[PDB]
Design a protein around this ligand. Structure first.
Ligand SMILES: *[C@@H]1O[C@H](CO)[C@@H](O)[C@H](O)[C@H]1NC(C)=O
Lengths: 50, 65
């Protein structure tokens, strides 16, 4: 679980752009305001390699 | 963090800074001047100094003095 990728972002990267920001992403009407829920998600996720 | 490091009126001193594809690029020039009321008309082209692989977004800046 040490390896991660970004599953959510505001907009696509420019060439060689790098981004460490961890803030909760909003995908719809729900005001997420720092917590997960329906259309509210933590942006970094793991492959869980087995 | 702390991911990169490098070490290298009488005058008008002139600089240019620009960022392209996550590279960051600098140019400059230095000259004597006759008068200080406004920028003096004429030519003295600026020349490159450094080109840094920063991989960072820049939208604001400030002078340190
Ligand atoms: C840099 O990040 C800011 C804040 O997210 C954003 O407004 C800006 O559009 C980004 N820079 C460029 C060149 O798009």
């Amino acid at each position: 679980y040490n390896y991660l990728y970004r599953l959510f972002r505001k907009s696509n990267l420019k060439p060689f752009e790098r981004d460490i920001s961890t803030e909760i992403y909003q995908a719809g009407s729900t005001p997420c305001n720092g917590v997960e829920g329906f259309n509210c998600y933590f942006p970094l996720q793991s492959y869980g390699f087995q | 963090n702390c991911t990169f490091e490098y070490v290298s009126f009488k005058n008008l001193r002139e600089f240019v800074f620009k960022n392209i594809d996550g590279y960051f690029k600098i140019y400059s020039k230095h000259t004597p001047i006759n008068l200080v009321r406004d920028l003096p008309q004429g030519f003295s082209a600026l020349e490159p100094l450094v080109d840094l692989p920063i991989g960072i977004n820049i939208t604001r800046f400030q002078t340190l003095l």
